Amino acid sequence: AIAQLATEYVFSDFLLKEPTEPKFKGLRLELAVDKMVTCIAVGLPLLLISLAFAQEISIGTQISCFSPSSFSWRQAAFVDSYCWAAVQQKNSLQSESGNLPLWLHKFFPYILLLFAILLYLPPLFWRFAAAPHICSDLKFIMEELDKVYNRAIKAAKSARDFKYPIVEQYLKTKKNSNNLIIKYISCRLLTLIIILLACIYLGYYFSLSSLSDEFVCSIKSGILRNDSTVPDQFQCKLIAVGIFQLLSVINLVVYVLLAPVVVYTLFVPFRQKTDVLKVYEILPTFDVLHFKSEGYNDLSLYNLFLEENISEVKSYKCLKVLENIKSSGQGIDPMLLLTNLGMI
Amino acid sequence: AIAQLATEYVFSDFLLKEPTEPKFKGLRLELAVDKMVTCIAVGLPLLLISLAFAQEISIGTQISCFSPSSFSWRQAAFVDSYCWAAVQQKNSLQSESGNLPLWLHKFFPYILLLFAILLYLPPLFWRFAAAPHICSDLKFIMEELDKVYNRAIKAAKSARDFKYPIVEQYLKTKKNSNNLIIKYISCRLLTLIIILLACIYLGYYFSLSSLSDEFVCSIKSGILRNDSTVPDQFQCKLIAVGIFQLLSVINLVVYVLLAPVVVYTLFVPFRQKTDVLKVYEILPTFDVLHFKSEGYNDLSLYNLFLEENISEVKSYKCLKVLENIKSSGQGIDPMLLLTNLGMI
Amino acid sequence: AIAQLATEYVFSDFLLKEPTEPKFKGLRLELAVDKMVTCIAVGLPLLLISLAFAQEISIGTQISCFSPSSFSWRQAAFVDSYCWAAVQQKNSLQSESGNLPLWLHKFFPYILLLFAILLYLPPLFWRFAAAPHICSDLKFIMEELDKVYNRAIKAAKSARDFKYPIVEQYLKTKKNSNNLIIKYISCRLLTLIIILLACIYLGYYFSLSSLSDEFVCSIKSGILRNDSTVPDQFQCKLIAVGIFQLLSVINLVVYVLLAPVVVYTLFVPFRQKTDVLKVYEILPTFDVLHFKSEGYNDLSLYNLFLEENISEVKSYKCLKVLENIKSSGQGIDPMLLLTNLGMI
Amino acid sequence: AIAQLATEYVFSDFLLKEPTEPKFKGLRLELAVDKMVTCIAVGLPLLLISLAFAQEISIGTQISCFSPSSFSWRQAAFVDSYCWAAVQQKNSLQSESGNLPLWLHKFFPYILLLFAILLYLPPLFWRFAAAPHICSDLKFIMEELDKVYNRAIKAAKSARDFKYPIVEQYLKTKKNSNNLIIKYISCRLLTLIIILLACIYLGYYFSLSSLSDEFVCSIKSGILRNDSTVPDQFQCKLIAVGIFQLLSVINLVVYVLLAPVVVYTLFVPFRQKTDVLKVYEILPTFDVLHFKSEGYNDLSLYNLFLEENISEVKSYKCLKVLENIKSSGQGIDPMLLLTNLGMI
Ligand SMILES: CC(C)CCC[C@@H](C)[C@H]1CC[C@H]2[C@@H]3CC=C4C[C@@H](O)CC[C@]4(C)[C@H]3CC[C@]12C
Ligand SMILES: CC(C)CCC[C@@H](C)[C@H]1CC[C@H]2[C@@H]3CC=C4C[C@@H](O)CC[C@]4(C)[C@H]3CC[C@]12C
Numbered sequence A, B, C, D: 001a002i003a004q005l006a007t008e009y010v011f012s013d014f015l016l017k018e019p020t021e022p023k024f025k026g027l028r029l030e031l032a033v034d035k036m037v038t039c040i041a042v043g044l045p046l047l048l049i050s051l052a053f054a055q056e057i058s059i060g061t062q063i064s065c066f067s068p069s070s071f072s073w074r075q076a077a078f079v080d081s082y083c084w085a086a087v088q089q090k091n092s093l094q095s096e097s098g099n100l101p102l103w104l105h106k107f108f109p110y111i112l113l114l115f116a117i118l119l120y121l122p123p124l125f126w127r128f129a130a131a132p133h134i135c136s137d138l139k140f141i142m143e144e145l146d147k148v149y150n151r152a153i154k155a156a157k158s159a160r161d162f163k164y165p166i167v168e169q170y171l172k173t174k175k176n177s178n179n180l181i182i183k184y185i186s187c188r189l190l191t192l193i194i195i196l197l198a199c200i201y202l203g204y205y206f207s208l209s210s211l212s213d214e215f216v217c218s219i220k221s222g223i224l225r226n227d228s229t230v231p232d233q234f235q236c237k238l239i240a241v242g243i244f245q246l247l248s249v250i251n252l253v254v255y256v257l258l259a260p261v262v263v264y265t266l267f268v269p270f271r272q273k274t275d276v277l278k279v280y281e282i283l284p285t286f287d288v289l290h291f292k293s294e295g296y297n298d299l300s301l302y303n304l305f306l307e308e309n310i311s312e313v314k315s316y317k318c319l320k321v322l323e324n325i326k327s328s329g330q331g332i333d334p335m336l337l338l339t340n341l342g343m344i
């Protein structure tokens, strides 16, 4: 039913499932905006496919040819099925709009499924190629941040009663390499191109005259070519073509609204803001150097992933509340850190 | 069946499922009133869609055109399907009420699903954008309250046998920022606007003459335009239109009753009452300062979320019972706190 | 099937599911009588809806109009569907009993579902508004009782080899407030009113002549108004109306039997008997004062909830067996308590 | 399918599910004979309902009226559905056996479901009212038996290298109260009465002439009353009536065989034999006094429940093997108990 399709595709965790494995425990591995874009671009065409053939919206068979009254039920059924299979056969049918509109009307669900698969492909390539590496690197970075926070609080407590910036060096090294950012931009660009092509197709499909679904059909090949009792042609109409056009314009609207989001996503350096690591600069055990901005490198992408999935880090949360309290400046950062006692 | 739909949509945890993740363990992340509003506004139109096409209420096909007796079964089926697809084609049909009523009668389930999706969108945006931040902040606040309660009871026990207000400073800082409250008000306002538009549409749909479902249909395009055996027109009726109007007025009543709730929700500062933190003011380790009221800021929203999901805090419950006992004034707050022995 | 519906709605845990959350572990949060009343009042109309359209009891379509023999199958189907949709349209049909009986016959499942939803609403309001508070308070009370029992047995063992009545003070304070009892009485009263209205409706529906299901139908609007081959009217009958009346009288009987139960529930103070706390009065560490009776206050409701869900408390069970043994008076209460050794 | 129904209702744990809660861990809370009686009396009529309308045994529709050849398919369908709905309407039909046989033939599944529900009601009342109390009491009794066994074995080991009969006093007190036994006897008696009424009904239904399923039907009310082309009456037959009678006699046989079991159950004191507590009399720490027999009191019912669900007690099992070995008398009870070393 329509409501069942809605529950499956919008109100359920459709493509929102976290990786089912212990390797990525709590790691999104995909930005929220990218996940939203993929979920829409994939589950919208599927939802429209399901809707267009819902038991309520669908009168019945997808084509009716209006055989003569003399024709029996199965003769008329032969006519309808023959014309359905003959939309491909150009000789059999003669339609003013041509045969491409008939092909599109017959295979619209296939085309929507193709667009959905093509849009799901780049996210899958990301999740299967560049996701494990970033997952491992980000897990190491979070562990290093937790360890340095613990060491700093232990030092502060000892004072009240190595020291090498490994994480900073690793981030600096990531500043050079750009394979991950190149893959990310390539997959986003392919998604954008697929969306644009889908928009072109949907606009063309919705621009039809709405009468191209009606085509003339001739069961006059073979032994029936010279038969007399059979009329030379029939009036066939492809039902649900109006529904297809409505859903196609809906998908076109959604995709044109979505494309600016993908374009904004492509410009990762601009998105790289609100320095996540700036909060850690007040730790004595952490060097006061952010050095993450203004670069078409994997460093900006790692900064984005950190700003996305750093809320799960207790040390980061503690430092963030310390920073927020520092806005008033009533107290002292080391005193607040010592009082917090948030090692684990 | 009707009962199955009821069990799924009203008697089950439809959209009442808690976040399936360890990040939010026991945190609602959504006020009870907001959750009720979203659940109604989403699962009502879906329930009505399912009901309108229930196997019992539905006689059968959604349109019947009453072809002549001479017409065969599949000729009549062609007529019915053609008219169903031609509700869009204005030339084919001539109805007194126009063609918009026919469009609405055909696509009412789609319109209800659209309203449900549009009403579910703002809650989803909230849960995916502003929910993680408030979850982390509120978890930190609850942990700080538990820790300060433990410290105060330990101090009392030591007396019987830092001290910095970090949580108060954090709340004071939240008094300034307003991004969360702005997002909350924006999503509530969008929900209200969607509800009002849905009410307008449902009122228009229910105001129809009830005879607009009957339209005249002409299969007279193409080779059949000059055919003689076919009548110039047919009498088609869209079944289930009365059911659609009944369910639409039901939804209109529900939404007009719900809109005052959304308006009351918009005025969060008025809702900010019954100070949750007032109970903690009797703790020696906690400063006697509430400072949370009369502000279009995130502080009021945090106060609401605390008053919502603070019952899970054992320290808060203990302080609440101490406060309630203090109404009589027979005993002493520190003595009762020491006797409680409710560290964990 | 009928047996499947029975298993789902009477032999299964339909609305008998305990709260699926760790917050309420073993707490009913709903009295047994109230749960029975809600389960009946909700799952009876749903069961009757399912039964009335069971594949065995149902001959087929819900209306047959007996078109002339000259009419084709789909002409007759048009007639039947038109009349089904025209029960609303007063002009189309002319029935002796009127049009309200036809409306009721068509929408009886909807009306039963409406009554079920309206009866499920007050229980849901209770469980979502006043259940968390009573759950927290009752959990605290049980924990306090366990702690005082442990302290008393420890003192007895020490003798053989604070002391403040916090729980008693909390109960005394609850004696004043009445918001929970007011909400309980309001929800019970609304349930009673809904049940009475349902009884009125079912009595009216069952009082019909049983021939109102037969109505005269006229497909004579539009181009067919002046058509000659079509008869001026048809004889239509709404099938399953007898089944609807039978199930409606069954529901009426059940609801009239249930209403006295709801009225008895409304009088909570009378139900407040068999003092649960009287057993704890023999503990040296517990003050000898019950002070819970004769009040339209939340104290009586808390006493009811205690008498309901106190069997899970080991200390209460031990004190109950001590009390029962004290009926003979052969031994001594402190000696029996010491011998029991039931700390945990 | 038939085999699926059999698997669900006889070969599966239909109504044999243990209470899904930690409160009753391993406690039957229902005697084996009572559970068997309830399972049969409930799942037999449901199984017969399912069988009577199985896709294999069922030819098709439940009534056929044999309309004239001139009648079209949907005219004949109208006739059949009209007569199906008119079995209630006495004026419409004229049958030699009357109208009650037709009512019974139409609503036999409803009557079987009613009997099943009425037979399931007393067991449900027991499980929801008197089951928690007996569960708690019996758990306490088992814990006391385990503790006294442990104390006795510890004393024996100490000798080789309070003392109050709390459980005996509790059982003696149970000797007085009789509310549980009264509820048990009342529910068993109601089950017996329901079974007898079901037997009466099934005997009456099976005693029919087998031709009462054939009734004369007249679609001659309304505009068709004076119509000429329609015959004055039709020959309608209610299919599956023979299957209903066969299954009804099967159920009658099962219930008459079952009723003696219920009568034997009612006489609980006679069932109270094979003293379970007699084995514990050899323990030095346990007083040598059974005092459980010859009483219409809850003590006999508790003895039955003990004899039912005491096999789970390791101490009871050990004492039972000691008793069995004592039949030969080769050894000594205290020596065997010491050698067993079965504390836990
Ligand atoms: C997904 C991508 C590939 C879709 C590409 C656009 C498709 C949908 C449409 C839009 C415009 C279309 C073209 C419009 C006009 C003509 C001229 C005609 O004589 C042959 C077909 C041809 C050449 C069409 C082929 C298909 C076409 C290119
Ligand atoms: C992503 C955005 C830009 C998509 C917007 C949809 C645009 C591309 C659509 C809307 C209407 C469409 C046109 C409608 C009709 C025709 C005439 C046909 O003989 C060739 C294709 C052509 C010229 C279409 C090309 C694509 C088109 C211009």
Ligand SMILES: CC(C)CCC[C@@H](C)[C@H]1CC[C@H]2[C@@H]3CC=C4C[C@@H](O)CC[C@]4(C)[C@H]3CC[C@]12C
Pocket (backbone or CB within 6 Å): B197, B198, B200, B201, B204
């Ligand atoms: C969800 C929102 C967009 C719904 C907006 C209201 C819709 C349902 C209805 C209510 C009143 C309607 C209008 C009423 C009157 C007219 C004048 C007519 O000559 C053209 C259509 C037009 C202009 C209608 C368009 C659709 C309309 C605006």
Ligand SMILES: CC(C)CCC[C@@H](C)[C@H]1CC[C@H]2[C@@H]3CC=C4C[C@@H](O)CC[C@]4(C)[C@H]3CC[C@]12C
Pocket (backbone or CB within 6 Å): B196, B199, B200, B203, B204, B207, B256
């Ligand atoms: C949220 C609340 C205010 C909704 C209440 C429903 C209101 C808006 C509904 C109920 C009846 C409706 C009117 C019914 C009939 C017409 C005539 C038509 O030619 C234009 C629209 C118009 C004028 C409708 C406008 C909207 C309307 C006034």
Ligand SMILES: CC(C)CCC[C@@H](C)[C@H]1CC[C@H]2[C@@H]3CC=C4C[C@@H](O)CC[C@]4(C)[C@H]3CC[C@]12C
Pocket (backbone or CB within 6 Å): C197, C198, C200, C201, C204
């Ligand atoms: C659930 C509640 C609202 C149901 C209320 C009772 C319903 C079922 C029935 C019972 C008696 C009925 C009334 C009986 C008589 C008349 C007089 C007639 O000229 C108009 C309808 C009217 C006024 C009926 C309206 C509907 C009615 C009130």
Ligand SMILES: CC(C)CCC[C@@H](C)[C@H]1CC[C@H]2[C@@H]3CC=C4C[C@@H](O)CC[C@]4(C)[C@H]3CC[C@]12C
Pocket (backbone or CB within 6 Å): C196, C199, C200, C203, C204, C207, C256
């Ligand atoms: C909860 C208890 C009291 C419900 C008992 C059912 C009662 C209320 C039912 C049973 C028969 C019913 C009556 C049957 C017939 C008519 C005639 C009609 O023109 C007006 C309503 C009226 C007068 C009904 C009113 C309600 C009624 C009296």
Ligand SMILES: CC(C)CCC[C@@H](C)[C@H]1CC[C@H]2[C@@H]3CC=C4C[C@@H](O)CC[C@]4(C)[C@H]3CC[C@]12C
Pocket (backbone or CB within 6 Å): D197, D198, D200, D201, D204
């Ligand atoms: C479950 C219980 C209520 C069933 C009771 C027995 C039912 C099945 C049957 C068995 C015998 C039957 C009775 C036999 C004879 C007559 C005399 C006739 O002129 C009216 C019906 C009446 C009075 C019957 C009513 C229904 C009846 C009582």
Ligand SMILES: CC(C)CCC[C@@H](C)[C@H]1CC[C@H]2[C@@H]3CC=C4C[C@@H](O)CC[C@]4(C)[C@H]3CC[C@]12C
Pocket (backbone or CB within 6 Å): D196, D199, D200, D203, D204, D207, D256
């Ligand atoms: C539990 C045991 C005793 C049930 C045995 C079934 C008995 C009660 C059945 C079997 C045959 C039945 C009888 C068959 C026929 C008739 C004639 C009818 O006009 C009145 C009922 C009457 C007289 C039935 C009464 C009940 C009956 C005697």
Ligand SMILES: *[C@@H]1O[C@H](CO)[C@@H](O)[C@H](O)[C@H]1NC(C)=O
Pocket (backbone or CB within 6 Å): A222, A223, A224, A225, A226
């Ligand atoms: C049909 O008859 C025509 C007559 O002109 C002939 O040319 C043609 O070959 C025939 N077709 C078949 C399939 O026999």
Ligand SMILES: *[C@@H]1O[C@H](CO)[C@@H](O)[C@H](O)[C@H]1NC(C)=O
Pocket (backbone or CB within 6 Å): B222, B223, B224, B225, B226
């Ligand atoms: C139908 O016949 C008419 C006669 O006036 C002619 O004008 C029209 O073109 C014909 N239509 C078709 C589709 O051949």
Ligand SMILES: *[C@@H]1O[C@H](CO)[C@@H](O)[C@H](O)[C@H]1NC(C)=O
Pocket (backbone or CB within 6 Å): C222, C223, C224, C225, C226
């Ligand atoms: C039907 O014919 C009658 C003849 O009196 C006329 O008044 C009426 O307008 C016609 N109806 C239609 C819909 O053409």
Ligand SMILES: *[C@@H]1O[C@H](CO)[C@@H](O)[C@H](O)[C@H]1NC(C)=O
Pocket (backbone or CB within 6 Å): D222, D223, D224, D225, D226
């Ligand atoms: C049918 O015709 C008879 C002729 O005697 C008449 O008495 C009766 O009222 C008519 N019935 C209807 C429903 O018009």
